[PDB]
Amino acid sequence: FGNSRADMEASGGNSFNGKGGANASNTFSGTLTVTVDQVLANGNLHVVGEKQIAINQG
Amino acid sequence: FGNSRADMEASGGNSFNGKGGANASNTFSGTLTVTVDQVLANGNLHVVGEKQIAINQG
Q1: TM segments (chains A, B)?
Q2: Set of chain A residues whose Cβ sits within 8 Å of the Cβ of B21
Q3: Which has the closest alpha carbon to A46: A34, A29, A31, A32?
Q4: Chain breaks in chain A (C to N over 2.5 A) after
Q5: B18 in contact with A at a CB cutoff of 8 Å?
């Protein structure tokens, strides 16, 4: 053990941090009058409708 | 990996912000006496009227 033959010192480190995420949203509010353009075999009604508003510059 | 052969660093950005809008309004308040100048086939009355006021300088 003389002459620092067995003296030793070591250190080590390892680090990892990952993360992730996502999100989506949508809202819609209004009222629209549509018209029936087809009646299906079970009585369900296909409906289509369009509202066009022009206010000033569009 | 010596001589910084694999060391690297990059950055990037992209931004966009658009917006728009319009609005219109009108108000009218008053009283006017008009005259019937036509009676339609369903009894509705076509009416026309004019009021002219001159106060001082117009």
Answers
A1: none
A2: none
A3: A34
A4: none
A5: no
